[PDB]
């Protein structure tokens, strides 16, 4: 006769990822807790506070081009998308009628770490009376950019740039140079279909050339927003409560393909201008995401037989051929024949105009 | 007894505009995802990236009247609507009992790609301390005006202006001048119900004397927003998920007359302060457009045995005649009875005022 | 056998205001499209682009007080409100049994034409470096005020103002001592009961002394909005989709009285700031309404019959007599007996205080 | 069989105040129209535009401190709040059985009357351009400060202020040191449960003094919202549509105590610069009040009879006694006895800690 | 026969504390109304407004850095967190089958309570008008920082920094260096997992060190919004109606923990910007909190026989041993089999990658 606590999900197990190794079931439900520290300019290596002050999730500097046609940007003066990637385990299959079972992001609490922090109002930053150079120094304020993106496959990227003159270093960074082996073109200033890629790296696609995709992110949610400006303050909410739902119009959210899961993201704040010359560094704040997945049942693509093709495809040379796909393509046309329809009139009759 | 996966709709062929070669059936859906590039300016042929710096994506200038009368505004300084227009293929007809299938633009999704190539602040701009010429090198900033619109037919435009004073070129742009062959008068810094025009060309309208038209778009749903100022910081948002509607109270959405789909946009983003004077070239960045269409049946308007009508307009001459209709016209009246009314007193009595 | 199209409302006929002579029925819907030009300074008389550069659209200058004391604003220089009357037909009377049709504003579609035209950076305005007068000529910036209002009776007006030692012209222009016939005194500052007016005239009422009545408007939907400052960028936001609706709490909505439907508007938009001196021109944009309408059967108000008291009325001589109503009524008492009550104790017993 | 048309609340009688004499029923629905005149600084007495140029509306100045002790506001410069109260009639009291009948504000239109006025850009204010004297006389902008309150008891307000050196005039105007006898302490400057007042006088308790009460105030809606900065533009919405809702989560809303209904208000809208010094009046808006009110059977709370009690304590003495309540007070322990409870062991056992 | 009024929830008894010494029930509902006092810099002890002029309410000052190395921030500069803990009392135990009552935070009104203090522009603060040293006294103004959390344990804290070479004084406040007692590294300038803290202490974590964590708070509800800049005006909204809801996607909301409720909270509303030098102390205002709390069945989770595990706990010796847990681990491996599979192949087969 006692009274009944009211039912809620009965936790199975916590603690990190080995956690995952437990066989649960078909109605587990998985809350992974992660977080991703802002890549832009100063690598984390040389951990010791005396090289340079540590800049650590700063900026290095930031030296204007010396003409119209001389802009260097120099590696570590970039803000960089910041990748992460969460190897899930296997999951059961089905063969005997084909059917496969995956991970599914339903949900996601995301949240930027460290807004408070940004009332540091001491420090060797310019002040705000400099004409006795007394007062405040100046807190974090500028351009603002804050994206992030959860999703079962890397994000895929676009290339625009402000002027192509731009020569980025040939090293340590991913530019369009490097992606599409040839220079940059007038058309990379507005939209080339052939400036792609994706984020698999992480630390090395600045924000300023690779933004996020529309055309291509099909398993990726991706949310974004930009504040331009020059001394534009700061705007920052965090709660423990809103949670974002990545499912889509069918009902499904990204299925984790492989096994990963891929979060990115980028956080910048703004500058802070220092004291000798208005050198801005960058800043940027840690991103916290907390997914929410389950297990679905799909349909298995690919006929796994295929790997007899693959057998046929080892053993098989590797031609050279003449060109049947592309640009110089030598098949001049392919028609498929399914049924048997009545004998047609003008058998090619399609948009009239 | 192998476990179901959840229905979704299914992808019969993707690819490019040749997939829609073919006849799928009364209940398909289709997604076609395009993109508009800025035209503003500075036109894309000179492709070399020594010409000027390559413009394209950019104005070419901007330069002041010389006195209250004189403005001459150079056509590649004006920004201009861009404009693209989707041929999509054929489909039934039913005339043996009046009706007709055409497609129909359900919903849309768009995005203004490139808000953080305008993180690039490097680069010989105005610099942000001038009394050193050190800092940064002032990021986009200014007037910004996106407008996008999806339609069935192309835009209508109405013509506003500044002073219509204003002295444009009669060459390789179109102002209302070029469509009301008469100069331009007073009324046209206000309204104007016959400075009306369409938005057939692309990158000829500037978008500083034609204004989407809210009287006449009735197949097109169009979207907009202008912000003023002088360092007014940019503000975009994008994201992988929300959808706009483009249905209405009937719920019909752009019905797509002919058989194309117009799209139209344009996405001033701010202007960019060079270094020796203070030229202002404009800013534009790209937009993503992906509609989803589906096949209505609707009543075919017109009576196309009115063929014969056309024959009959064909070997009949051209009359000049004298006015009956417009201006001059030389119809008294014209009264048209239907039915058996009672003999009435007053047979002309109306609002009375 | 062939497929239905979807049921949409019928559109009997299109065109302009001789389209409403047509006798439909009690069920139909009209949906009138008008537009509103910006009356602020300057009169749309004189045509030519040559009398003073053609401020039709703009106010005329602005010429502040010489001392404190000192006030004249020049009628040419104040923004007014804009009004027209749209005189729909006479309908249907039942007087056999007392009710009445008449017209009732359903819904409305607004939209402030003509945003993209402050995108004219050229010209002779104050440009951005005043230093070397070079740059950018400054766009329109400053204070604005978006006030719309339709309804079935002209707005009613109140009257306030910043000090009331302002001298305004006493002629082509409505001002409180035009309607007060005595002087304006210190409670014009704050709000007099006994400042109001309508909006009948049409440029005549300025906008910094006449405001919409909260009181009064009963049969009138007014929305506004105003923004302060001295360079506040402006914003503006059209649509081709959403629509208002000017319904109320009993689901009636402004009823067209005598038969007009009245739109007022005023768009300012900002400033213009020319280059000898900084005057300061106003800037007023169009605004276009489309009213959705339709015929609701009323109770009729007026006892028709009364018209013979309106015969009474003028056989009858006019009297001056002595003061029964107003300020020095000679009418202690008035009691109206209805029924058969109980003998009451202290027969006048109310609110104890 | 003549149409009907559609059932709407029927108007008994409207007027003035008087009209509330009319005996209506259980069901009527009583909508009273008032309004607030802003009270900041300069009284409304002497009403000749002679005196100072007729600040009612306005403050009368500012001067800053002289030292870091010195402050003396003279108060005509501190904007106060507003406060009146509507006297309703008495209502019916059924004692046989207890209970009793009161009235209810239901729900409240407010709205800001002069936004308009703000347009003023003549006038002697600083000018725009200070270097020349030229340009526009600068519109109000500033720290703006909006609350109203509708209740049924005056608006419990509670004490907070910035330094609590601050001397005010110990005449006409109400602070901390005329309701708590003794002087400001710092505890005065954050929170102090005993700074308390209610707003029963007009035009006295300043605003930058006292805060409307989040502890106290049950039987009173208060809405507010502060702006700060030195040039923040105005902003104002007006609108004849939308309404606010009085009720509580138990569906209640003010009940009317004794008869009346308090309206408080306070609208500052900024600042104005004159143009010898830089003198700072404020300037405040009337508030239009609309307040639909209802009767509800309410519980007597009080039992009548103890008007014996009264009699009880009029006839006895008044007495000095000892203290027994309070700081100070005499009573050790008072323990209440209701039923029977099982006899228990340890008798006082409670939070442990 | 008499009317009966609406049923509303009886109010038993309210007060103080002490009130909730009364044995109610199992539905009832309390209310407890409490406010925090903003802690940022000036302790409250030294009273008397002749110390300093009593910053009661602000920060001290702020001095910058003299170099890039030499940061020490003077702990009364530093605003810090405000913390509160309200002892509810103890509840029934129905240990004869496992459960338990415990307080529930079911909601939450919260305000900040003296915004219109700010409107205080007299005072020895500098002038609008430096130049001539007149005007207004520039009221607070910069970066904003709210934040407010609702708990049944102390919030968990994270630890991020600006330059990590800050040296802090190591009394009277606690900085990471107190928590990990090794010094600050450069991954504390991004998110180092190891610089976790609770808010045990009340004024002692300074806000620009310990922010609110985003991976541990679970019984603790925390909302929260920054707002950088020098002079980003501020903003407040007060409202006596709308109320938070404290419940999450199980409906329960925080579980009050041993027996005590957690309010935390810090509001930063800008700068003051001093005469002299620019000396920028901080503002602080205070929140009230309103929390509804009701009472809840749950299952107790600890095995209370486990009392005679202390015992075994307190005879058997503290043990040094060798490391079986943590880092340097000396367990190879631990495996749990519960029930009877068959025969596994290869006997660990997980995800393969």
Known sequence: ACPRPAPVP????????????????????????????????????????????????????????????????????????????????????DLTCDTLQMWEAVSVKTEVVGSGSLLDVHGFNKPTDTVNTKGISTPVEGSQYHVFAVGGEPLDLQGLVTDARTKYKEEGVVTIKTITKKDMVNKDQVLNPISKAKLDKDGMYPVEIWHPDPAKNENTRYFGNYTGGTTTPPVLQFTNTLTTVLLDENGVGPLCKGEGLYLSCVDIMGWRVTRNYDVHHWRGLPRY???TLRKRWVKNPYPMASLISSLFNNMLPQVQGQPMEGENTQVEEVRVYDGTEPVPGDPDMTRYV
Chains 1, 2, 3, 4, 5 share one sequence.
């Open 289 to 291: 995401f907390k997914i």
């Open 10 to 93: 009965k936790l199975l197990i916590k603690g990190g990822m080995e956690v995952l190794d437990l066989v649960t079931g078909p109605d587990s439900v998985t809350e992974i807790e992660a977080f991703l520290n802002p890549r832009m300019g100063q690598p984390p290596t040389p951990e010791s506070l005396t090289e340079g002050g540590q800049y650590y999730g700063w900026s290095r500097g930031i030296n204007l081009a010396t003409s119209d046609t001389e802009d260097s940007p120099e590696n570590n003066t970039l803000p960089t998308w910041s990748m992460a990637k969460l190897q899930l385990p296997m999951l059961n299959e």
